[PDB]
């Protein structure tokens, strides 16, 4: 009566948000889940601790979605490394992939990015694929277009990895599915910890009212967002709000990003995963040089964290006027300017090194689309995994989620469950007969 030991260990996103990269080890098989970069770090430190292993022993690599913290390091791993296994991702994911990293570059060069394309295989949702002795398939994760939750089976043992997911339907995205096939192990995100913020209807109303308030008092409203993802949802909301308020029809809304033309084009190519994306009050803006910053307006510009680029340029030219305002709609990662601002600093530092007073208003209305405790608990209750591994949340939020889940099952339902809280590099060991 033998027993096989399964090993799970994060090289990134272990007790943190950023650079997701988790290694699975079972019966001679080695799997890597995601391969992104930490938005709050730079250089080689923004990468996961891949040095703890050698890329030549990794049979399979699965990427959940196109966000940089999940695939930002892929080109590097596929070119400048000794990796020779197979890599898979959703069709939409790969599509939106080539157009996201490029905008990010302007680690790896646009050449390294192209040399990657051919090393990445695609997979449809609900379709079994097999590599080495590994069977895998994916379910819709909600969150962003093409996002997936990968189920993996090896020797009868099943593990579901959620990547980032949302159980609440968007204005254009479907809610994550709850698989009927029960996993032995669940690796799940913990971004929001146990925090349960306003409902969608409330968040949208507050978002519109804040934007309205800013332009009404004569200010410019800045909304940092990466080219594709949540930005598309915000645009639908704004265009619709403007349509219902003609007094705003003379106030321009701009969608600014490099190649924003293909961003919408390629994005609509996958309507499968009236055309609302035919905006009547929004226009594309290529860069600061094509912008006549004349009067009040609203500008949605990347990068989402204002670490640099246009959103940062705009913020720097607008932060000293009380009439202006910025709305942060995404999860703020440590080390990020967007995160810092929300501290109410008296002044900020220009990329040049200048010091400017922060007078423009700063509002945080989250549209990052991650599950919350209620969704996560319901998710876990339906799947009933004996083992749960948390992997994409700040230390304290993750700790709170873990204690809440343990309390819910051990104390309340008086049922046995095991929740793991691995730090980067820390391994989790499980034995299957
Ligand atoms: Zn994400
Ligand atoms: Zn993420
Ligand atoms: Zn009105
Ligand atoms: Zn127990």
What's the CA-to-centroid distance between 411 and ligand 4, angstroms? 9
Residue 166, beta-bridge partner list: none
Do the strands 134-140 and 148-154 form a parallel or antiparallel pair, or are they unpaired? antiparallel
Distance in angstroms (rounded) separating the CA atoms of residues 47 and 41: 8
In the chain, which residues fall in CATH 3.60.15.10? 1-198+368-433
**Which of 228, 271, 267, 235 has its CA nearest to residue 102?**
228
Catalytic residues: 370
Is 195 known as a binding-site position? no
Tokens 């996958």 belong to 270
Is 212 known as a binding-site position? no
**Which of 173, 172, 150, 154 has its CA nearest to residue 163?**
150
The experimental method behind these coordinates is X-ray
What's the CA-to-centroid distance between 372 and ligand 2, angstroms? 14
Distance in angstroms (rounded) separating the CA atoms of residues 332 and 406: 27
Question: What is the Rg, in whole angstroms, of the alpha carbon atoms belonging to the chain?
Answer: 22
What's the CA-to-centroid distance between 18 and ligand 3, angstroms? 40
Is 65 known as a binding-site position? yes
What's the CA-to-centroid distance between 336 and ligand 2, angstroms? 15
Establish whether the linkage from the previous residue to 339 is cis, with ω within 30° of 0: no
* Number of alpha helices (DSSP H) and beta strands (DSSP E) in the chain: 11, 22
Residue 224, beta-bridge partner list: 301
309 and 303 Cβ atoms separated by less than 8 Å: yes
**CATH architecture entry for 199-367:** 3-Layer(aba) Sandwich (3.40)
101 DSSP assignment: H
- Taking the CA of 209 as reference, the closest ligand is 3
Rounded (5°) CA angle 196-172-269: 140
- Residue ranges near ligand 4 (ion) with Cβ within 5 Å: 416
Distance in angstroms (rounded) separating the CA atoms of residues 58 and 54: 8
144 and 65 Cβ atoms separated by less than 8 Å: yes
297 and 211 Cβ atoms separated by less than 8 Å: no
Alpha-carbon distance values, 67 to 8, 46, 347, 360 (Å): 22, 14, 30, 29
Rounded (5°) CA angle 344-346-349: 100
**Which of 75, 40, 42, 54 has its CA nearest to residue 11?**
54
What six digits make up the tokens of 317? 């030219």
Is 392 known as a binding-site position? yes
Resolution stated for this PDB structure, in Å? 2.1
158 and 180 Cβ atoms separated by less than 8 Å: no
Rounded (5°) CA angle 93-97-99: 135
CB-based contacts of 131, cutoff 8 Å, min separation 6: 59, 60, 85, 86, 88
Establish whether the linkage from the previous residue to 36 is cis, with ω within 30° of 0: no
Taking domain 1-198+368-433, whether its CATH number is 3.60.15.10 is answered by yes
What's the CA-to-centroid distance between 69 and ligand 1, angstroms? 7
144 and 70 Cβ atoms separated by less than 8 Å: no
Is 420 known as a binding-site position? no
3-state secondary structure of 364: strand
């Amino acid at each position: 009566e033998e027993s096989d030991q399964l090993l799970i260990r994060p090289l990134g996103a272990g007790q943190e948000v950023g650079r997701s990269c988790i290694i699975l080890e079972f019966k001679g098989r080695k799997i890597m889940l995601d391969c992104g970069i930490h938005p709050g770090l730079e250089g080689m430190d923004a990468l996961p601790y891949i040095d703890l292993i050698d890329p030549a022993e990794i049979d399979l690599l699965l990427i959940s979605h196109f966000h940089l913290d999940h695939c930002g390091a892929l080109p590097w791993f596929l070119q400048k490394t000794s990796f020779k296994g197979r890599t898979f991702m959703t069709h939409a994911t790969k599509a939106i992939y080539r157009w996201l990293l490029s905008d990010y570059v302007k680690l790896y060069t646009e050449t390294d990015l192209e040399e990657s394309m051919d090393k990445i295989e695609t997979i449809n949702f609900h379709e079994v694929k097999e590599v080495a002795g590994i069977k895998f398939w994916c379910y819709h994760a909600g969150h962003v277009l093409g996002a997936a939750m990968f189920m993996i089976e090896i020797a009868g043992v099943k593990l579901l990895y959620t990547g980032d997911f949302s159980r609440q339907e968007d204005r254009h995205l479907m809610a994550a599915e709850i698989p009927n096939i029960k996993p032995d192990i669940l690796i799940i995100e913990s971004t929001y910890g146990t925090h349960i913020h306003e409902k969608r209807e409330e968040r949208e109303a507050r978002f519109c009212n804040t934007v309205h308030d800013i332009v009404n008092r004569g200010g410019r409203g800045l909304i940092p967002v990466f080219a594709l993802g949540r930005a598309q949802e915000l645009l639908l909301i704004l265009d619709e709000y403007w349509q219902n308020h003609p007094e705003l029809h003379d106030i321009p809304i701009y969608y600014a990003s490099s190649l924003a033309k293909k961003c919408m084009a390629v994005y609509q190519t996958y309507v499968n995963a009236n055309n609302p994306f035919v905006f009547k009050h929004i226009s594309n803006l290529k860069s600061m040089d094509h912008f006549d910053d004349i009067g009040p307006s609203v500008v949605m510009a990347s990068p989402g964290m204002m670490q640099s680029g246009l959103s940062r340029e705009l913020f720097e030219s607008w932060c000293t006027d009380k009439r202006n305002g910025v709305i942060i709609a995404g999860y703020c990662v440590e080390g990020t300017l967007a995160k810092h601002i929300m501290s109410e600093p008296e002044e900020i530092t220009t990329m040049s090194g200048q010091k400017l007073p922060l007078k423009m208003s700063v509002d945080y209305i989250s549209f990052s689309a991650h599950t919350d405790y209620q969704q996560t608990s319901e998710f876990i209750r339906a799947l009933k995994p004996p083992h749960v591994i948390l992997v994409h949340g700040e230390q304290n939020e993750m700790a709170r989620l873990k204690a809440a889940l343990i309390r819910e099952y051990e104390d309340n339902d008086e049922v046995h469950i095991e929740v793991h809280n691995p730090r980067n590099t820390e391994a989790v060991t499980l034995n299957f007969r």
